[model samples]
Target: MVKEIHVEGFEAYSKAAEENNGKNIFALFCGSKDANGESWCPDCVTAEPVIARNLKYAPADSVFIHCSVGERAFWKDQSNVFRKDPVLKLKCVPTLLKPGTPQRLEEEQCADDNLVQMFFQEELEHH
Candidate 1:
């Protein structure tokens, strides 16, 4: 069975990414909590269940990371490292990626099961 790992903030994501390096990793970067602690990012909220369901289709032993990014304002700021990283350059929330691979699904694509499942199955074939 696939396991889901939840992390808060960029540093937390970075730490976990190191551990999952070279593993078949599906990393989802989402938005942070509101003042009441509920997710304020709609796209992030929309992708969670789809990500979970599609997790079963990913290659066996693949790790699914639930990366909770910071506030809406924090993300929109041009200086955010996530947006500046050479490989990341993340522009929106609910970004899903197979770290180190070209298999990246962003925004609405994160919720696209067929697209995501295809990546899971295809990566299995190619790898």
Candidate 2:
């Protein structure tokens, strides 16, 4: 299990970037208290801190957004796009998005070793 780490203040954001040397961009999808409570889900509340801490090692230019699942108004106000989409399908409280893609980075205990190897093994060999 990953350890929990809460980050406070904007400075911590910058510090996290600086420490990582700004290589890749990251986006965090979070759940607001109202939304989380309405859903009656423990995953968001418990997993968020773990996600935040793990992100510290990622490269900079990472953007984080916390959305309230229950509050459509709040969602509409912040990002007009999300207003139309159904929020429930986008499960995984702290979804991590890379710089350009809507896809989340794969999470695995052996991610470092498996990522490139798996890509080549599956994607390259067939081509």
Candidate 3:
């Protein structure tokens, strides 16, 4: 089975990334929560179960990183670190990517079981 890491912010994500240990790194960038513990992005909430359910299809040696991109206001800013990160440059929430590769699912794409399954299965094929 693959390893899964859940992180809440950029700092936590950065710390977890270092522990990847040269394994295949797949990342999911989603919305942070309100005090109620629900994500502000509706698509992220929708995609959450789909992504989680399908992640087991990924390569056995891979590490799946699920990150909450912080509050709504923090993400809406054009200067956010997630948008500025050299590798990510993400423009939307619920973005799933293989970090250095072009393999990705964005926005509502992450909610689709077919696409999410293919994304992870493709990793198993190529890895």
Candidate 4:
């Protein structure tokens, strides 16, 4: 069973990784408006359900890391990992990371036709 689904802007990289069954794994790093302020964004609310749905099919070991606005470190140890990176800018809310790669698999925008749909579609084909 999948206990946690990592989401960003409604896109579920965990699900994508799960669909691939460890052949590939991914992580979801979310950017928020302020430190400990996940409840403040309309886009966050809109994206939650999509993430929930993705959890239904995502890998069981997947983890989620939430980064606050301005790339503020919300998670102490994890923050150190992403604080300075060459490939990932950490400027966006939901950035997906590919397995064994530092680069983002995808970035989501609130008005971009629902990122979950796009992520799901892409993974479905790739898997």
Candidate 5:
């Protein structure tokens, strides 16, 4: 079964990643939601469900992390760790990535149903 975890900010993201290490981790970096629970990023709103629907392609025991990048202003800041961290350096919202792997899809790519499904279905690369 897939395990889903929602986290905001870099700290919580890091914590979740550390705790879920070794599993098939699919990390989704998206916009933080408002009071109505809708993300400020339209792309994220569009991509979220597509990714969720395709989660069936993920291997069993996979961990899915929905990481919010905070308010627009904070996310746009040059100093934001999500943008500055060597491992991340996120340039945009709604990024789907498999940590420690080259597999990643960003921005507009995240909204494509075919792409999202393929991303989830791909077998993990082993070194």
Candidate 6:
């Protein structure tokens, strides 16, 4: 059901998801270095597999963006655009949320087992 998208940069991810940014946009924020090579954040790593498994529960044709949120220092800064971006006031690494809906999982929530699984269902209800 999920239409997975691999967007590297912040602007790119936002732009790519904008086409149908209504009820079908899912954004994955993670720590990145080495050019989308891998995430340095432990929480992101732990959340990856869980998110992948639940993609099946996502809306049909919904865009799932794997966005790189830069390195540690840049992401940790309070003023970081990724954190302050009006579209998403992301507070931590490895956050997953529907761009248009209030449905979002932040920080440790991303690593949760049942909660993330439930988020999949929540996405359906949000629409």
The TM-score values for the models, in the order shown, are 0.86, 0.38, 0.90, 0.42, 0.92, 0.84
Best model per TM-score:
5
RMSD of candidates 1 onward, in order: 3.1, 9.2, 2.9, 8.0, 2.6, 3.2
Rank all candidate structures by their lDDT, best first, as comma-separated numbers: 3, 5, 1, 6, 4, 2
Q: How accurate is candidate 1 locally (lDDT)?
A: 0.78
Residue lDDT tens for model 1, 1-127:
7667888888888888788776777788888876775678887778778878887887777888788888888888999988887777787888887766777777888788887787666552334
Clashes of each: 0, 0, 0, 1, 0, 0
Which of the predicted structures, 4 or 5, would earn the higher TM-score when compared with the native? 5
Question: Would you list the clashing residue pairs of candidate 6?
Answer: none
Stretches of candidate 3 off by over 4 Å are: 123-127
lDDT of 1 at 82: 85
Writing each residue's lDDT as its tens digit, candidate 6 over 1-127 gives 6767777668787787776566467788898846555589988888888888877877565778888878888887899887788878888878887765678888788877777876766642434
Itemize residue pairs with steric clashes in candidate 3.
Answer: none
Q: Over the stretch 2-102, how does candidate 5's per-residue lDDT look in tens digits? A: 89999998999999999988788989999999999999999999998888888888888799999998999998888899888887868799889886667
lDDT of each: 0.78, 0.37, 0.88, 0.43, 0.87, 0.77
How far out, in Å, is residue 108 in model 5? 1.4
As a whole number from 0 to 100, the lDDT of residue 121 in candidate 5 is 74
Residue range 28-98, candidate 4, lDDT tens digits: 55554445545354555455555556544444454433323333344233444343455444544445444
Collision pairs in model 2: none
Q: Which scores better on lDDT, 3 or 4?
A: 3
Model 1, C-alpha of 127: deviation from truth (Å): 19
lDDT of 3: 0.88
lDDT of 3 by residue, 48-109 (tens): 89998898889778999989999899999989999999988898998998887778889988
Better of 1 and 3 by lDDT: 3
Selected candidate, larger TM-score, 1 vs 3: 3
